[PDB]
Every structure is written in structure tokens, then in C-alpha cells.
Assembly symmetry: C3
Homo-oligomer: 273 residues x 3
Amino acid sequence: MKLQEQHYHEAASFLSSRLPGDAKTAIILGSGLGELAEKIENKTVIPYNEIPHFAQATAVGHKGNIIGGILGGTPVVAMQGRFHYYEGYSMDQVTFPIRVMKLLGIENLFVSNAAGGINTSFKVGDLMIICDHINNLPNPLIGPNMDMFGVRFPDMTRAYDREFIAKAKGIAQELNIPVKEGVYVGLTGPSYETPAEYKFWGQVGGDAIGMSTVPEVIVARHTGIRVFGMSVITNEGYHFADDFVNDEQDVIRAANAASEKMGAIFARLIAAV
Amino acid sequence: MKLQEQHYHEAASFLSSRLPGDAKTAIILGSGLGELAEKIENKTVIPYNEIPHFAQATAVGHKGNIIGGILGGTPVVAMQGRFHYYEGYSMDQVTFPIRVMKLLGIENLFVSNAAGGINTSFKVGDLMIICDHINNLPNPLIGPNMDMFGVRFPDMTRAYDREFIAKAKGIAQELNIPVKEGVYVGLTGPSYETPAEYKFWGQVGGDAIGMSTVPEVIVARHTGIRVFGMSVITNEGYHFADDFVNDEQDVIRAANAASEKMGAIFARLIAAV
Amino acid sequence: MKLQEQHYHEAASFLSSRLPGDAKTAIILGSGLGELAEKIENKTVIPYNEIPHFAQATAVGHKGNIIGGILGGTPVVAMQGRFHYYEGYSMDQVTFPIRVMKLLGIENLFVSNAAGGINTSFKVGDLMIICDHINNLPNPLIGPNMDMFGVRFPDMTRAYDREFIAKAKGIAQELNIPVKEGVYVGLTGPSYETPAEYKFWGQVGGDAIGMSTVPEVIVARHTGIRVFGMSVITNEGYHFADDFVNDEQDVIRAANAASEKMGAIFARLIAAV
Ligand SMILES: Nc1ncnc2[nH]cnc12
Ligand SMILES: Nc1ncnc2[nH]cnc12
Ligand SMILES: Nc1ncnc2[nH]cnc12
């Protein structure tokens, strides 16, 4: 009850005394995307293992650092690597960083991920602006409500900020970067989906599928952080070849290759919001 | 397992020592609806925190009392307020009162709740007779079966008693209270749905969405209790205005507003079952 | 992370001392299909209670024996009965034997089950080759990956081996046994589905529904085990009579009736792999 609040405060104290403290935007760097850290200038690198009550990062392609610094001439806090429910963690553990971000004075959260394309018009390499999601992981707010952070029953009507989507599209046009928009479906994993599951999710309004994001987005919105999301389509959950197989490394490679274009958007978006 | 039997009997023994005992019908008053307890004459009020093994009603707009008395000239046991999975309770705790009712001799259970309308003909203020449900919460029966209560694989072909539905429609017709009929979809919450979730659930057959009712209905049916169920449509999960937000007090005020019409149907229905 | 490896090794070592160790194919016999054990000759029966770390079979119609011997002229190992999530076992518990089978040198898993039909052409007593599934149970791979068995993110594009399906098809034709083909939807249970739920899964591409099998397959696929799946349709989740109920004993009856034909396919199939 009082112990939980105190844990947030302890993690936030620790970061505050190591970070500048002027950043209003945090960025979550997903599976193929951790090397966008290279674009952050004047880096203060804080390993998750050093931070009170942060989980200890086990997913492949997830380094596990808080990075303080400058992106698009703008103070930033990045999560290099993110936690996932498939790792064994509770939702409380997965989303812990988002509430620590609130305590640091973060107002905007940009979130990226590697996602499977289930809209048959999305192809490997495409960047998708997340316009909405479907949650199929346990809701992260289950349990007693942390009133310090928000209301018992938060609105999810526009989880993905309309102004941010508008500005990101404007920016993509400026930069000659094509973007898609659509609905991200959040599933636990960690196995990739069967064709039947892919077809199911596409049939009910899914455009892309992955294993993160939604929980942190629900927790962000619960505490009034404005959210922008961007998937990299790293594989196509349709048109299967007779001997096709999804692969951890092919997803990471495909995200790696789209990192520079997504990074460019994030760099100008951070200065725009 | 006899430990759990011990628990049920202790709660039943306690309640039976305070209640008249002649009630054959129990009612559950949901978010709208604690006001219906004013319509019960000769009340005997039993705080949940006095009853052995009863969980505590932490949900806002849920008082947490058993209330025996007379409704429409008929003996009743009411649950003024209820338990929800989003609270952090186990399904066992959420549904414990249902099994206690059984041991008290309750044969019928009228469930009411607040619900979002997902079919576009369902408007704020509408009363919707639940004629079926789709479960998206953990099933309350996972675990060793409690043989004292029911079979291992209970049937759920007509969970919402047809006879009670037919009577209610008649009673509605007599009282000139227009009623809708449709499928209730139960999610965990506690965050309201996204438009993509609302749309998904409407696509597959849902008419209204709530965070309750399904677990209790399953357990009631597991133990042969006949179920009538009605939602108040408190908000419309479709045709979203650009700045629309879902809200807890908005739902409660909508439920309150509709209370009386629901109350009138329940009082005549209890008298005719 | 290190303790669990040992548990798998203790179980396999216990089984390896009692079995002759040349079986390459294992078979799971589900509800009402335990009788198929009669086909197996030179049986060595090893009750689950004896094997280190095996859970207890608690589902009616599930004896809980590992049986070694000869079926179809071929060494086999059979799980006579299986575990289910609805029993309250963790997915680690439910799927533990599959990993134990891998350590025994099992290369091929033949999974059977009883299932409700949601395809309207699928009638009581029909045999349905599973060509894909939709998982609606907790993913059994959640938590730290066991690297000694498989990769963090294993592929489920062809969970049900295509050559095994072709062979089953040809065999069924030879034996003059009508077969069906379709997508099995895995649900937790234990309560049977509502008409609304049967309709949902039907709409989204499910052909049959049950409470098993999907965890074992994910777990088998994770460790490279080639899988063949067959359902017996033991009920029709459609066109419900006014007074129809599902019934555990009815389901067991139907599977019984269909044992002989499933076993005749299994016996030919095991010798053809
Ligand atoms: N197809 C897919 N489904 C779920 N998560 C993923 N992460 C990368 N590709 C994915
Ligand atoms: N739209 C909605 N979703 C879930 N629970 C509710 N309770 C009232 N309205 C609701
Ligand atoms: N209709 C049904 N639903 C779930 N599991 C089953 N097993 C056999 N019939 C079933």
C-alpha cells in the first residue's frame, strides 16, 4: 500500500540525481531499435540493473539502459530495451518504468516496437503509426488502484494522441519517409502466431501484431502521459511460403534496417511536441 | 479442499443466523444501482467486512452489504455492491458470495450491471436483458472442482433462464418500459475499451460490455441457480466525438438515472419467479 | 533456471529405466480415448503418480499412465490421459511430459482430444484432422526460456506437420474412414461454451473447440517435435435444441464410439512416419 508508492519514489530519486531533469519526452526503443541510442547526444547511460526496483531485462536485442541526453536538439530520456510479459514479469514489473517516468516529469511517451504485419498491404520495412490498439495481454491496472498515478477506470478513447499523429505525418511528408497507419494488437507471445491467429486478428481489425506496448500505453494513459507509437513491420503474417519460418534474428535485422528512418521521425517529433 | 467447504459453510452459517431464511431469490446491485436497496422493506443490513471470508468491496460506487428484506412482497437477499476481478481478487473471492447464496437456499439470482453499448441501437439509458454472454475474464471454475457445488464441466447453453426473460419482457410491456435484449461481453477492465476493442467485440456478436457478471453467472449455473440478468447502458462505445472521454461518475449517474425503471422490473419479476 | 533442467532429467531418467527406449513417436490419448491403450501390445504401464514431478491426472476419463509398447507394429509411448489448465495446474505442469518425451528421444507427437464442433458440417462422431489452432489459453512458454529445449520465440507457421496430414489423409482413404479437416480452438474451460462463444469462434475461423492440446503443441513445436493432431467431434456447438445440454459423460460416450476408427488411423500413421 505505502510500500509500493515508496518503490516508485526510490527509483525516481535515483534517476533524478543522475539525469539532467529537463526532459519532458521519453522514448521506448524496441527490438530492432536499441541502436537509436547512437543518435542521442551527451548520453548519461544508467543500466536497469543499477536502478531500484527495475526488472533485469532478458529479451534478446534488449540492452536494458536508461539513457539521458539530447535528441533533435531536445532533452530526452530513453528506455534502451523494454520489459515484456512473456519474460515472466508481472504487469506491475513490466510497466514500472512508466510510472517512474511520470515522477521524473515526463509528459510525452514515444514508443516503438517490432510488429508482424497482418494488413496484407504492409510489407517488411514499413513504418506504421499506431492509431489504436487491441489488448490481449492481462490488463496492467488489475489490482488496487494507485491513486497517486490516476483514476480507477481510465478512458482509452484516444490512447494515441491525435496531435502527435498529425505532427508525425506532417514530419514524415517533410522527410520523404512513407508511413502507414493502423491498429496494433498486443499478444503475450512468446511463440509467434499461427496462420489461424494471424487471420483472426486481421479479421477483427488488427493491422500489426506484437508482444509489448499496450501495457505501457495503458499505464501511460492512466497517468496522463501523451502517447505516440510506431511499429516497424518486421515480417508478414500472411502469404506464407511452404517453408517460411519467423525468426528472432530476421525480426531484429529488419528493425535494424528501419531504425534510421524511424529515428529521423522521432528526432523531429521530439522537438515539435 | 474441505478447507474451502469449511469456508463456505462458515459464511453461510453466519448469514443464516442474521437472515430470515425464506428468500429464494438473490439480487446483485451493480454500479448504477445501490439505490435499489432503498426499495427493500424491513431491511437487515450485513456489512461484507463482518461476514467470514467475504472480500471487501473496493470499487467506487459499490457499498458492500448483504441486505435481506422484502422486495415486491417477496423475500430477498441482495448484494449491495459486488466484487470485480479488476480489484485484484481471485475468481474464487469474486464469486464466493454466489456459493454462499446457494447454501442459504437461493434458487434464483438477478444480476444487474452497468455496461457500455457496442451495438449502435443501444443508447445511454437503455435497459438490456442479458440473453447470453461471452466470457473474456478468467473462468471462475479453473482449479479442482468443488463437487459439493456442481459438476466439473457445467453446461452453459442457456445460462440466462428463458422463462425469466419471457416474464421480464412481459413485465416491461406492462410497465411500458422499453427494453433491449442482447449479448453481454465481460472483460477484466479496469481501463475502458479502445474504439478498436469496442469494434472488435461488436463485430463478433456483443451488444454491451462490462467488467463483471460473467464470473458470477458461470458459478451460479455451475450450482444450478437460475439466472436473470439486465444491463443499464451507461455510455456508448461507438460514434466517438473527437473529445469524448469515458468516465466513472458519468457511468454511475447514468445507472442511477435508469435505476427506478430497473427497480420496477425487478420487484415485479421477483414476485413472479 | 538451473533447478528445472534437473527436474526434466529426473523424470526422463526414471522413465528411461522402465521403457526400452526405441520409441520415436508418442501419443496423447484424451477424453474417452484412454481405451485406445488396448491397441498397444507388450505394455509397460507407469502410473503418473510414480514419475518424478508429473502432476496428478484429475480429469474424469483421464487415468494418468505412461504406457510403453508396440502399436502399429511400432514402438510407441502413450500418455493415457492428459493434464489440463482447467485443473489448476500451471502450464509448466500441464506441458512437463512433452519436454520429458523430448529427453526420451521422441521426435513425433500424435495428439488426440475430444472437441465441440463449431463448423456446421462437422457432426457428432466425426474425426477432424487439426491443420491449425487458435490459442486462447495462457501461452505455456511465458517466463524464462529453457534454452536446453528451444529458442525464445519459436515459429508456429506450420505447427501441424504437413506430411503427417497428407499421410493421415491417404490412410483414412484406404481404411474408408471419412475425415474432416480444420482449426482447433483451445479454450481454458472447464464450463462448456455459451452459444454466443461458439458463434464467435466459428465466425473467426475456428472449426472445433476444446480445453487442451494447444499448450502441448506449442511446447512440442518449441523443441522440434513434429506434431499430428486429431479431434473427435463429441458434440455440436450449434443449432441448439431448446433443452439441450452438454454433458461430460455424453462427450466421453461419443469419443468412445469413435476410438476404434481413430486408433485404426493412428496405428497406420505411426508405422508410416
Ligand atoms: N509476427 C509477430 N507477432 C508477434 N510479435 C512479433 N514481434 C516481431 N514479429 C512479431
Ligand atoms: N464501456 C464500458 N466498458 C467496460 N465496462 C463498463 N462499465 C460501464 N461502461 C463500460
Ligand atoms: N463444446 C466443447 N467445448 C469445449 N471443450 C469440449 N470438449 C468436448 N466438447 C467440448
